[PDB]
């Protein structure tokens, strides 16, 4: 991808595939509704 992907997975397989694929890089699952989105976003932007 060039632009960041937007995944549409009604079955939930793609999210677990992404979890497994980037697990070695310490991938974090968050949500837009969660109030911790700001801190997680800033931490990701500063530390990969």
């Amino acid at each position: 991808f060039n632009r960041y992907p937007l995944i549409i997975d009604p079955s939930g397989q793609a999210t677990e595939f992404i979890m497994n694929e980037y697990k070695d890089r310490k991938i974090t699952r968050t949500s837009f509704l969660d109030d911790a989105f700001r801190k997680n976003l800033e931490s990701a932007l500063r530390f990969g």
């Binding site: 310490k26 974090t28 931490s43 500063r46 530390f47």
Partner: protein, 49 residues
Amino acid sequence: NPLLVQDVESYDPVLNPVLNREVRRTGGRVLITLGDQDIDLSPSFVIFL
């Protein structure tokens, strides 16, 4: 990077977390809170006063 600091009689208390090794490990990084901003502490750092 190794660091040598002179005039230690004018010691800056900003070094207190660094000398105390008050590190916070999260996400594989080693976070040191130098004042108000977080810095990823590289393991090769050393300071001599």
